[PDB]
């Protein structure tokens, strides 16, 4: 509309209305020029790719994308508390995206010093993939999302994708994508871009912890009319065989007949936080649960949803099984165990098997007069009829949605890193600096982004008499307030925050 | 009414869905020891990123597998013994063993080896290699799992998963190109020799 008239205002806040929450977030972004406007082939052998399991082939593009998949984008820590303490469930409904107050800069080195000034004729290209024709990279828990603190300015990530490969070489079925082939909108410093999205119907994420365990659902006061086999022998001696039977009742609860059985397991190795207990060998990769695809071994991470540890065993964690976040300022490579925070899904222990334990036992043979009964450990167990399980929890730092791969079939599409699986997730938003001339003007753009999500809530109806567990900040005397900036002005998040505090009956 | 049979090949593989340019914010366990010697235990962590793509956390996992014996078209490569019946994967019903044919939908062979085919796993010899993106190889183990608790006295031990049932977060493709038996329950009724399953 004009160079001297602003194209949009600054909206950040949350409105709590009844069963719904509306969270608006507005950030200031900066977009450079990537690859000097050049689509470029990339593969492992460029960096040497010494492992076959690491072999990849794909392209890096001049475009950039806006990523708001993580939760702390849309929720302040306070708003996250109000959500998790008061609600049994939630899920997104509507999405509203706006891109405005674009500004483009040109970079020049005059004499020995660098110069930057407004380029008022330059444009920015932006488009959304609403037919989902491009490779969808959002659901891989990648970096580059809007900063948790709204006062930080962030650098848009460079888009890219991969396709089929054999070793580092491509194949005849591989694909290539020119984002320029998509109709996009072009924006001058007076233009602004917006669109509205509609989440597809998904189940509420369950932000609650069961108050009953799957094997304790019985009435403790009453016997069962069913019978179990108590004795196979009368006593010590020869030819003592017998069959005795007993009522399943309160005195012995292990053997009662039950209608439902815990969810599936794929065993993880168990690592102790205290380092002395762990074995003195390099078993980090050689001892890890993996799955192989087309000859390549992928680590199983995080894997099926399973409790992190048995009750009263805080030190142990199940290797690749639990999500691990870095603390503020954490180094990229080979950091110490203290430098990172390992989350533990012990909330789901009641209905889900412990990740580091065998699912159970099965008989391996037929007993006979000449053969004793023999059993073996079930290390992994697929779905059986009558299993129940809980999904993995979502965190303030964790992902929100993923795209369900488009396939003939799937089971319980809910993604394994947590969040809402969707066949048509929020579409990707691609952006780039229009090239201004293989010799171009060095140029970058900056502007604002606002995003608005409407969340639906499931209120807590419970009749529990005694008070709940609640997420709370302790009353402490320390140098720095939690979830706030320090003296140098750095914002940090002290610990990962789970969603499961309130309880329900099983 | 039945779903549209998928007649395409994925251009991506299940494990490669990541953006190759960017790091994850997640961490993994890189080193369990500092160096060679006694009492070297440590825990070191590193960001999962493009440099090492195997260890990244992923939202979905390949479909189920029931392993088939691998057979080469070059008769010199194969063993000098009769393994057609003993070797073959079977399922037992009421005391009667039944060969598994064609079985669950699985990639016929690894990429780069086309001379091998699953014993009972193919329609006769068609190859399923189109689906090797989302499905495990019929001649391969699904993966590994830990068999014990490590400790100061015990090294970590793993074992090979030969068969794996459904897990939450699996995706798979059906066989490339029937009546649904009338039962209390079924899962993914699409028939194993291919086509459209229907209750009528």
């Amino acid at each position, epitope marked *: 509309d004009g160079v001297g008239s602003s194209s949009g205002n600054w909206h950040c806040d949350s409105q709590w209305l009844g069963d719904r929450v509306i969270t608006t977030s507005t950030r200031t972004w900066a977009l450079p020029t990537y690859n000097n406007h050049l689509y470029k082939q990339i593969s492992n052998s460029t960096s040497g790719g010494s492992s076959n399991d690491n072999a990849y082939f794909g392209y890096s593009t001049p475009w950039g994308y806006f990523d708001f998949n993580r939760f702390h984008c849309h929720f302040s820590p306070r708003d996250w508390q109000r959500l998790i303490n008061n609600n049994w469930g939630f899920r997104p409904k509507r999405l509203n995206f706006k891109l405005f107050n674009i500004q483009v800069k040109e970079v020049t080195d005059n004499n020995g010093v660098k110069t930057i000034a407004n380029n008022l004729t330059s444009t920015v290209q932006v488009f959304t993939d609403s037919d989902y024709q491009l490779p969808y990279v959002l659901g891989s828990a990648h970096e580059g999302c809007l900063p948790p603190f709204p006062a930080d300015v962030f650098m848009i990530p460079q888009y890219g994708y991969l396709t089929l490969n054999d070793g580092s070489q491509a194949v005849g079925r591989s694909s290539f994508y020119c984002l320029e082939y998509f109709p996009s909108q072009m924006l001058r410093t007076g233009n602004n871009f917006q669109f509205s999205y509609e989440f597809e119907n998904v189940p509420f994420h369950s932000s609650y912890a069961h108050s009953q365990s799957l094997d304790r659902l019985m009435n403790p006061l009453i016997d069962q009319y069913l019978y179990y086999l108590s004795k196979t022998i009368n006593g010590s001696g020869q030819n003592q065989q017998t069959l005795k039977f007993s009522v399943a009742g309160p005195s012995n609860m292990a053997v009662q007949g039950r209608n439902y059985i815990p969810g599936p397991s794929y065993r993880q190795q168990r690592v*102790s*936080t*205290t*380092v*002395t207990q762990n074995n003195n060998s390099e078993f980090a990769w050689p001892g890890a649960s993996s799955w192989a695809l087309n000859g390549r071994n992928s680590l199983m991470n995080p894997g099926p949803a399973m409790a*992190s*540890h*048995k009750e*009263g*065993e*805080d*030190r*142990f*964690f199940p290797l690749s099984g*639990s999500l691990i976040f870095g603390k503020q300022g954490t180094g990229r490579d080979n950091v*110490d165990a*203290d430098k990172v*925070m*390992i*989350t*533990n899904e*012990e909330e789901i222990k009641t209905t889900n098997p412990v990740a580091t334990e065998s699912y159970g036992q099965v008989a391996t043979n037929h007993q006979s007069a000449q053969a004793q009964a023999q059993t073996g450990w079930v290390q992994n167990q697929g779905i059986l009829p009558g299993m129940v399980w809980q999904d993995r929890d979502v965190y303030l730092q964790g992902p929100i949605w993923a795209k369900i791969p488009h396939t003939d079939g799937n089971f319980h599409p809910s993604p394994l890193m947590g969040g809402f699986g969707m066949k048509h997730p929020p579409p990707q938003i691609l952006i780039k600096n229009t090239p201004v001339p293989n010799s171009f003007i060095t140029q970058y753009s900056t502007g604002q982004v606002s995003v608005e999500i409407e969340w639906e809530l499931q209120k807590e109806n419970s009749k529990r008499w005694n008070p709940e567990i609640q997420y*709370t900040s*302790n*009353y*402490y*005397k*320390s*140098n720095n307030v939690e979830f706030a900036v320090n003296t140098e002005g750095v914002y940090s998040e002290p*610990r*990962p*925050i*789970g969603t499961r505090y309130l309880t329900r009956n099983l | 009414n039945v779903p549209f049979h998928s007649s395409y090949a994925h251009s991506q593989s299940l494990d490669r869905l990541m953006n190759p340019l960017i790091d994850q914010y997640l961490y993994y366990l890189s080193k369990t020891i500092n160096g060679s010697g006694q*009492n070297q*235990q*440590t825990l070191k962590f590193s960001v999962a990123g493009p440099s090492n793509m195997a260890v990244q956390g992923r939202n979905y996992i390949p479909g189920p597998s029931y392993r088939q014996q691998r057979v080469s078209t070059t008769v010199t490569q194969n063993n000098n013994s009769e393994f057609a019946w003993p070797g073959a994967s079977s399922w037992a019903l009421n005391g009667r063993n039944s060969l598994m044919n064609p079985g669950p939908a699985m990639a016929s062979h690894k990429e780069g080896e086309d001379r091998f085919f699953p014993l009972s796993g193919s329609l006769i010899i068609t190859n399923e290699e189109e689906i090797k993106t989302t499905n495990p190889v019929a001649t391969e183990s699904y993966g590994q799992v830990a068999t014990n608790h490590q400790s100061a006295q015990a090294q970590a031990q793993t074992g090979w998963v030969q068969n794996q049932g459904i897990l939450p977060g699996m995706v798979w493709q059906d066989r490339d190109v029937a009546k649904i038996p009338h039962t209390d329950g079924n899962f993914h009724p699409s028939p194993l020799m291919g086509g459209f399953g229907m209750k009528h």
Partner: antibody
Amino acid sequence: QVQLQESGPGLVKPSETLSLTCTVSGGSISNYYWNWIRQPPGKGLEWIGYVHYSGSTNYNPSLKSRVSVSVDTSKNQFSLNLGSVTAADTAVYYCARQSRSYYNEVITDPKYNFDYWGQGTLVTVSS
Amino acid sequence: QSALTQPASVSGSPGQSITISCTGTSSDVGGYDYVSWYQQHPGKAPKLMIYDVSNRPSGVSNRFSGSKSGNTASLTISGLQAEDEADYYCSSYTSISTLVFGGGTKLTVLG
């Protein structure tokens, strides 16, 4: 109000095992980590080790060979057994409690800051 | 492991801030922010003045404070009084998840 009380023989002959028990009153053992500290008279504190109701233990590397720490949840008391004592083991033995952790969010080993302490008992090792 | 190193004694006149230090190796002190300070009156069990390097429990006055630079953590006592004379110990979490104490420091209030 949590109170700890150490009890046990005040005299131990060399090359014999030393035994002490701490009985917590007012509060149960619960999820807490119980520690043993010893102070040789006129010298600094030294940490023996701890025990957890799951039976987990962690010991001082110098004492790791000859020391053991046990817990009895039924009697609401935990114990110390130190074997092959010498005169260097004469000290005042304290039982302490690791401070309560207000968050169940992460998986970590305990970092030691003590919230409560016994009064301590003197144990002399002499022939 | 190796004990933490402290001055044997420090004295000051009432009203004057006092700083006690404990030096530790990179793995034990320098490495993590988990250093505690205990005061022990004669014949009493130690009391926890400061935990997690600079934090202090409820029941401890402003006058007690602590800080960490490199391999050395320091305890600062502001506006000290008569009741503030005791033995102060530095405690630290180590690399192998063991606890290590300083040698102890005696604070004498001149007067």
